[PDB]
Write an enzyme that holds these catalytic residues in place. Structure first.
Site, PDB file in Angstrom:
ATOM      1  N   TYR A 264      59.735  21.884  31.620  1.00  0.00           N
ATOM      2  CA  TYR A 264      59.562  23.079  30.797  1.00  0.00           C
ATOM      3  C   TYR A 264      59.271  22.665  29.336  1.00  0.00           C
ATOM      4  O   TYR A 264      59.589  21.522  28.937  1.00  0.00           O
ATOM      5  CB  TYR A 264      60.842  23.919  30.843  1.00  0.00           C
ATOM      6  CG  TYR A 264      61.112  24.424  32.232  1.00  0.00           C
ATOM      7  CD1 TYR A 264      60.326  25.449  32.763  1.00  0.00           C
ATOM      8  CD2 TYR A 264      62.035  23.807  33.071  1.00  0.00           C
ATOM      9  CE1 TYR A 264      60.490  25.883  34.085  1.00  0.00           C
ATOM     10  CE2 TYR A 264      62.230  24.258  34.394  1.00  0.00           C
ATOM     11  CZ  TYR A 264      61.470  25.302  34.882  1.00  0.00           C
ATOM     12  OH  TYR A 264      61.643  25.756  36.186  1.00  0.00           O
ATOM     13  N   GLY A 266      61.038  23.715  26.875  1.00  0.00           N
ATOM     14  CA  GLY A 266      62.379  23.451  26.386  1.00  0.00           C
ATOM     15  C   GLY A 266      63.399  24.055  27.309  1.00  0.00           C
ATOM     16  O   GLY A 266      63.044  24.831  28.161  1.00  0.00           O
ATOM     17  N   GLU A 268      67.434  25.605  26.789  1.00  0.00           N
ATOM     18  CA  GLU A 268      68.411  25.981  25.700  1.00  0.00           C
ATOM     19  C   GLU A 268      69.860  25.492  25.984  1.00  0.00           C
ATOM     20  O   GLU A 268      70.854  26.252  25.859  1.00  0.00           O
ATOM     21  CB  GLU A 268      68.400  27.500  25.562  1.00  0.00           C
ATOM     22  CG  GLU A 268      68.887  28.241  26.799  1.00  0.00           C
ATOM     23  CD  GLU A 268      67.809  28.765  27.791  1.00  0.00           C
ATOM     24  OE1 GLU A 268      66.734  28.143  27.981  1.00  0.00           O
ATOM     25  OE2 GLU A 268      68.105  29.834  28.420  1.00  0.00           O
ATOM     26  N   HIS A 292      62.229  29.365  19.762  1.00  0.00           N
ATOM     27  CA  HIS A 292      62.641  29.982  21.028  1.00  0.00           C
ATOM     28  C   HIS A 292      64.004  29.458  21.554  1.00  0.00           C
ATOM     29  O   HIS A 292      64.930  30.220  21.903  1.00  0.00           O
ATOM     30  CB  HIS A 292      61.587  29.683  22.050  1.00  0.00           C
ATOM     31  CG  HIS A 292      61.739  30.458  23.298  1.00  0.00           C
ATOM     32  ND1 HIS A 292      62.460  29.990  24.387  1.00  0.00           N
ATOM     33  CD2 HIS A 292      61.232  31.652  23.654  1.00  0.00           C
ATOM     34  CE1 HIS A 292      62.417  30.905  25.349  1.00  0.00           C
ATOM     35  NE2 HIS A 292      61.649  31.897  24.925  1.00  0.00           N
ATOM     36  N   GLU A 293      64.118  28.135  21.615  1.00  0.00           N
ATOM     37  CA  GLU A 293      65.337  27.562  22.096  1.00  0.00           C
ATOM     38  C   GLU A 293      66.521  27.871  21.193  1.00  0.00           C
ATOM     39  O   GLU A 293      67.623  28.124  21.675  1.00  0.00           O
ATOM     40  CB  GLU A 293      65.182  26.026  22.324  1.00  0.00           C
ATOM     41  CG  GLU A 293      64.060  25.641  23.272  1.00  0.00           C
ATOM     42  CD  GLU A 293      64.111  26.322  24.644  1.00  0.00           C
ATOM     43  OE1 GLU A 293      65.215  26.648  25.085  1.00  0.00           O
ATOM     44  OE2 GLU A 293      63.034  26.530  25.277  1.00  0.00           O
ATOM     45  N   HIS A 296      67.843  31.391  21.925  1.00  0.00           N
ATOM     46  CA  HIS A 296      68.674  31.440  23.134  1.00  0.00           C
ATOM     47  C   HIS A 296      70.158  31.238  22.840  1.00  0.00           C
ATOM     48  O   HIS A 296      70.975  31.604  23.667  1.00  0.00           O
ATOM     49  CB  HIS A 296      68.244  30.412  24.187  1.00  0.00           C
ATOM     50  CG  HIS A 296      67.165  30.877  25.111  1.00  0.00           C
ATOM     51  ND1 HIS A 296      67.276  32.036  25.865  1.00  0.00           N
ATOM     52  CD2 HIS A 296      65.987  30.313  25.465  1.00  0.00           C
ATOM     53  CE1 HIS A 296      66.212  32.176  26.625  1.00  0.00           C
ATOM     54  NE2 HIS A 296      65.435  31.117  26.432  1.00  0.00           N
ATOM     55  N   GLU A 315      64.892  36.312  28.424  1.00  0.00           N
ATOM     56  CA  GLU A 315      63.623  35.841  27.868  1.00  0.00           C
ATOM     57  C   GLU A 315      62.921  36.760  26.930  1.00  0.00           C
ATOM     58  O   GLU A 315      62.423  36.325  25.890  1.00  0.00           O
ATOM     59  CB  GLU A 315      62.679  35.289  28.952  1.00  0.00           C
ATOM     60  CG  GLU A 315      63.333  34.182  29.787  1.00  0.00           C
ATOM     61  CD  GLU A 315      63.687  32.981  28.958  1.00  0.00           C
ATOM     62  OE1 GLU A 315      63.123  32.778  27.870  1.00  0.00           O
ATOM     63  OE2 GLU A 315      64.552  32.289  29.413  1.00  0.00           O
ATOM     64  N   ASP A 372      62.519  29.632  41.401  1.00  0.00           N
ATOM     65  CA  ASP A 372      61.487  28.695  40.896  1.00  0.00           C
ATOM     66  C   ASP A 372      60.072  29.142  41.233  1.00  0.00           C
ATOM     67  O   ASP A 372      59.138  28.880  40.481  1.00  0.00           O
ATOM     68  CB  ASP A 372      61.702  27.292  41.444  1.00  0.00           C
ATOM     69  CG  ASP A 372      62.896  26.628  40.814  1.00  0.00           C
ATOM     70  OD1 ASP A 372      63.196  26.961  39.629  1.00  0.00           O
ATOM     71  OD2 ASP A 372      63.492  25.729  41.427  1.00  0.00           O
ATOM     72  N   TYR A 380      58.952  36.972  30.077  1.00  0.00           N
ATOM     73  CA  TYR A 380      58.808  36.649  28.654  1.00  0.00           C
ATOM     74  C   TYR A 380      57.989  37.724  27.949  1.00  0.00           C
ATOM     75  O   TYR A 380      58.392  38.206  26.930  1.00  0.00           O
ATOM     76  CB  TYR A 380      58.103  35.311  28.471  1.00  0.00           C
ATOM     77  CG  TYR A 380      58.859  34.118  29.001  1.00  0.00           C
ATOM     78  CD1 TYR A 380      59.494  33.272  28.120  1.00  0.00           C
ATOM     79  CD2 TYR A 380      58.949  33.838  30.340  1.00  0.00           C
ATOM     80  CE1 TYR A 380      60.172  32.162  28.579  1.00  0.00           C
ATOM     81  CE2 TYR A 380      59.665  32.741  30.809  1.00  0.00           C
ATOM     82  CZ  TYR A 380      60.327  31.926  29.906  1.00  0.00           C
ATOM     83  OH  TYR A 380      61.049  30.798  30.337  1.00  0.00           O
ATOM     84  N   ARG A 560      54.930  18.916  32.282  1.00  0.00           N
ATOM     85  CA  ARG A 560      55.308  20.243  31.872  1.00  0.00           C
ATOM     86  C   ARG A 560      54.590  21.185  32.806  1.00  0.00           C
ATOM     87  O   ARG A 560      53.362  21.161  32.859  1.00  0.00           O
ATOM     88  CB  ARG A 560      54.943  20.511  30.389  1.00  0.00           C
ATOM     89  CG  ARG A 560      55.480  21.836  29.854  1.00  0.00           C
ATOM     90  CD  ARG A 560      54.898  22.050  28.485  1.00  0.00           C
ATOM     91  NE  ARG A 560      55.354  23.266  27.803  1.00  0.00           N
ATOM     92  CZ  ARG A 560      55.068  23.526  26.551  1.00  0.00           C
ATOM     93  NH1 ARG A 560      54.569  22.599  25.738  1.00  0.00           N
ATOM     94  NH2 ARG A 560      55.407  24.679  26.077  1.00  0.00           N
TER      95      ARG A 560
END
Ligand SMILES: [Yb+3]
Ligand SMILES: [Zn+2]
EC number: 3.3.2.6
Length: 607
Positions: A264, A266, A268, A292-293, A296, A315, A372, A380, A560
């Site tokens: 990913y 990131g 969190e 973003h992280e 979180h 998200e 997944d 998001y 990624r």
């Protein structure tokens, strides 16, 4: 109820604490140890309970100093196998006991990637990292693997002494291991209650550099200097985030830059955000991921989705805060630019799954679905769109930021559903209920496809991107000469990316247009991962054979999923590179992250 968990639910019993004592065995690719769960009964006369497990070998279960009976049920695919434990004395309501489980993980644990020395930067030491979100913690240790339950934890982790362990927790010392002097024990404490998907572990040859009052960056030696610069805005974002969200409760905010196969952008993990090294553009331009992280730390980690059906809560709100941080640093027109980009990513997702696909709903029913496989941009960006629409409806960002801070305060340390959120929204905005009742809640929350209403966006920064994209789309051969490097001179990296995203949405273009674009813009030279990704997709979809090796390399040199899955899919859809794409996946599969390997297989229809 949590249809991704086979464990006893929170209404039956609740884990309050985990004390983990384990040793990382690189020669066997196993974690071995004991998970001591302090469990509180929520019912009278409780005589058994069930935990989630996945590919775990259980040696024994000890309560009150004696072994107890337990049984592993049949495997339920990606959910793993339920473990029922017979308690030796019935518990009354609110009674707590400690259940100590001796376990070993499988080398194929879906939570873990084990890397050989050759797969690292330094080439001398192996490396291990975890990723538990959504339901992979049960592949590390037995637990109620549901975000509806929050627990504190302590851990002691034995590793070879030349290596460092870190966790999603405050470091609480290190010592030589008494049982094996070739080893070191690292200790950890997480005193804030968390859902178990936030438990994380890395072991490798790690070094650190301080980049702010409460932030170290961690990586292999070869990446420290670059990472420290790339992420130098981190303190300034934490300060803004605190302004928007309330106090940061977690002590430290450290960053870990993972090896390239991190799946990913990131993750969190509290006290220690994990990031992809594909952020290392050299100019801080991908720092929205840090924002973003950081976000979180409020939305997700303090206020948490009660089940994965409600993942948009985590998200959507985090994207909304992310974009405020970036707006405060770089201006409101930039916030609108990013917002409008996000809508374009939502258009893409909807087009990819199809407008009636259930994975395009905001709230999704994950009964019998692997989280997944369902994972996408929808939670998001549909979530973000809903919140930006509400901001607009309800009087603007100052007003809506008041709701967001109240929301975080209200539900801190809790796990909630969409209905909880909606109820509080209506309570906070009671003087504006008539406005709230104009919202088409059923369509926004539960219908597939694009939302029924699009927000208003400032266009200032987007206009140049659209204009140039349109020039290229409408160009005929005799127009190709008029393009030149000066077309790009007033565009930021962000705008170059958006130009490519806009153009990609109408791909393919004629092969001669794409060749011209390389001739005049030299996009082959750009190492910014977002830009290079989109450019290579545009080249492959437009059937440029010269891009095949470039796309194969980017697909495999990092992992990624955002980049690797669509690159492999594009390469498989192009008849000229199809066989190579499949062969390359087969060659790399054993050394890929396990979840990425699974998903790239499904995408390619290979196995
Ligand atoms: Yb012409
Ligand atoms: Zn997120």
């Amino acid at each position: 109820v949590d249809t991704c968990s086979l464990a006893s639910p929170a209404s039956v019993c609740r884990t309050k604490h985990l004390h983990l004592r384990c040793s990382v065995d690189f020669t066997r690719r196993t974690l071995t140890g004991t998970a001591a769960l302090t469990v509180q009964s929520q019912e009278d006369n409780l005589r058994s309970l069930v935990l989630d497990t996945k590919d775990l070998t259980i040696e024994k279960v000890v309560i009150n100093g004696q072994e107890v009976k337990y049984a592993l049920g049949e495997r339920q695919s990606y959910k793993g196998s339920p473990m029922e434990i017979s308690l030796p004395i019935a518990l009354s309501k609110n009674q707590e006991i400690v259940i100590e489980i001796s376990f070993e993980t499988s080398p194929k644990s879906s939570a873990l990637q084990w890397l050989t020395p050759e797969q690292t930067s330094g080439k001398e030491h192996p490396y291990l990292f975890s990723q538990c979100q959504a339901i992979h913690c049960r592949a590390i240790l037995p637990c109620q693997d549901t975000p509806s339950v929050k627990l504190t934890y302590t851990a002691e982790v034995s590793v070879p002494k030349e290596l460092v362990a870190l966790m999603s927790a405050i470091r609480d010392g290190e010592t030589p291991d008494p049982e094996d002097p070739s080893r070191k024990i690292y200790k950890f404490i997480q005193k804030v209650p968390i859902p178990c998907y936030l438990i994380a572990l890395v072991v490798g040859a790690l070094e650190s550099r301080q980049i702010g009052p409460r932030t170290l960056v961690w990586s292999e030696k070869e990446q420290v200097e670059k990472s420290a610069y790339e992420f130098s805005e981190t303190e300034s974002m934490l300060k803004i985030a605190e302004d928007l969200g309330g106090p940061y409760v977690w002590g430290q905010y450290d960053l870990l830059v993972l090896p390239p196969s991190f799946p990913y952008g990131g993750m969190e993990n509290p006290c220690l955000t994990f990031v992809t090294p594909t952020l290392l553009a050299g100019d801080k331009s991908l720092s929205n991921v840090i924002a973003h992280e950081i976000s979180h730390s409020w939305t997700g980690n303090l206020v948490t989705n009660k089940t994965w059906d409600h993942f948009w809560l985590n998200e959507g709100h985090t994207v909304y805060l992310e974009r405020h941080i970036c707006g405060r640093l770089f201006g409101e027109k930039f916030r609108h630019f990013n917002a409008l980009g996000g809508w374009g990513e939502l258009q893409n997702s909807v087009k990819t799954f199809g407008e009636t696909h259930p994975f395009t709903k905001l709230v999704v029913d994950l009964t019998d679905i692997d989280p997944d496989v369902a994972y996408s941009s929808v939670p998001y960006e549909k979530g973000f769109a809903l919140l930006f629409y509400l901001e607009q409806l309800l009087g603007g960002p100052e007003i809506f930021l008041g709701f967001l801070k109240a929301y975080v305060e209200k539900f801190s340390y809790k796990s909630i559903t969409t209905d909880d959120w909606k109820d509080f929204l209506y309570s906070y905005f009671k003087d504006k209920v008539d406005v709230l009742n104009q919202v088409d809640w059923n369509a926004w929350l539960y219908s597939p496809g694009l939302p029924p209403i699009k927000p208003n966006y400032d266009m200032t920064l987007t206009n140049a991107c659209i204009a140039l994209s349109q020039r290229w789309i409408t160009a005929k051969e005799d127009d190709l000469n008029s393009f030149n490097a000066t077309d790009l001179k007033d565009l930021s990296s962000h705008q170059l990316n958006e130009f490519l995203a806009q153009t990609l949405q109408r791909a393919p273009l004629p092969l001669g247009h794409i060749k011209r674009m390389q001739e005049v813009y030299n996009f082959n030279a750009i190492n910014n991962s977002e830009i290079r990704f989109r450019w290579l997709r545009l080249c492959i979809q437009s059937k440029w054979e010269d891009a095949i090796p470039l796309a194969l390399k980017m697909a495999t040199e990092q992992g990624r999923m955002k980049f690797t899955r669509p690159l492999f899919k594009d390469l498989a859809a192009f008849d000229k590179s199809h066989d190579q794409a499949v062969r390359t996946y087969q060659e790399h599969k054993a050394s890929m992250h396990p979840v990425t390997a699974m998903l790239v297989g499904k995408d390619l229809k290979v196995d």
